[PDB]
Amino acid sequence: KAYRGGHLTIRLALGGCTNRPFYRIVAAHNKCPRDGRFVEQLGSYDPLPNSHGEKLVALNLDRIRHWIGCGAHLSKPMEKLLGLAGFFPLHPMMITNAERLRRKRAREVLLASQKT
């Protein structure tokens, strides 16, 4: 349509079934539906482990670079995955959640030590 005000957004689009997510990295407007008109699809993300177990990610890196140069506003799971790749720096929030995990594991270790 027209979508008065807004910008492109490299985001994840759900495309699976019930109890089976699957995400497609697409370049969509911010004001459009989640599964809707995307200007280009830039990759895929399988969160489910395989038979071997690999949680697959595929990125069209040059087109990602092109759409960032054109002005795409990436979303928070997208910076999470691009940092996990190493294309972007690692995200302060995911390392902070990691840190909160370190401290709660320290709490349960000390509590289990007092229990035993």
Binding site: P89, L90, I95, E99, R102, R103, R105, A106, V109
Partner: protein
């Protein structure tokens, strides 16, 4: 129980011959064009439909990946295509089982099928590339400093920490604490 006996036994050329198994079955239907799907099963509960399919009408004809003669009868000879269920006369269940029988014999080796001579995947076959050879290691990696040193926790001075208490007192939480290093 073990196949590859009946088809070179005597009763096979007694009842059948050099003709295929399915060369006698005529399915009954409203006339003209047959329905474009056979029955789902001849054996319902443990009872048989009055016009059994060529597989279901003889319980001796077992189907698996080692009944090579039966599987070649049910596959086409001049084309590498499996005969469809209206063409032959077998059930939906029997046609399904025959399809996995063909595939299992094909990938176990006990069946002839055509394989095309394929082209190489790439043009240049070198192995001197950064993704496929060694890379010059990072200074942090030849040392042991964490990459992007703002990842590491560094304790702020108590002065601006007290400034943060002044900003967010009343509803303040508990204190700080350094990261642990090694997990259990």
């Amino acid at each position: 129980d073990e196949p590859w006996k009946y088809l070179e036994s005597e009763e096979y050329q007694e009842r059948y011959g050099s003709r295929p198994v399915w060369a006698d079955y005529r399915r009954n239907h409203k006339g003209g064009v047959p329905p474009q799907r056979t029955r789902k099963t001849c054996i319902r509960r443990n009872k048989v439909v009055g016009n059994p399919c060529p597989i279901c009408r003889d319980h001796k004809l077992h189907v698996d990946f080692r009944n090579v003669k039966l599987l070649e009868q049910f596959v086409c000879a001049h084309t590498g295509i499996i005969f469809y269920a209206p063409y032959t006369g077998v059930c939906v269940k029997q046609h399904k089982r025959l399809t996995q029988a063909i595939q299992k014999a094909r990938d176990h080796g006990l069946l002839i099928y055509h394989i095309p001579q394929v082209e190489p995947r790439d043009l240049d076959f070198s192995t001197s590339h950064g993704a496929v050879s060694a890379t010059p290691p990072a200074p942090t990696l030849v040392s042991g400093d964490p990459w992007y040193p703002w990842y590491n926790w560094k304790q702020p001075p108590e002065r601006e920490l007290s400034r943060l208490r002044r900003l967010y007192q009343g509803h303040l939480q508990e204190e700080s604490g350094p990261p642990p290093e090694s997990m259990p």
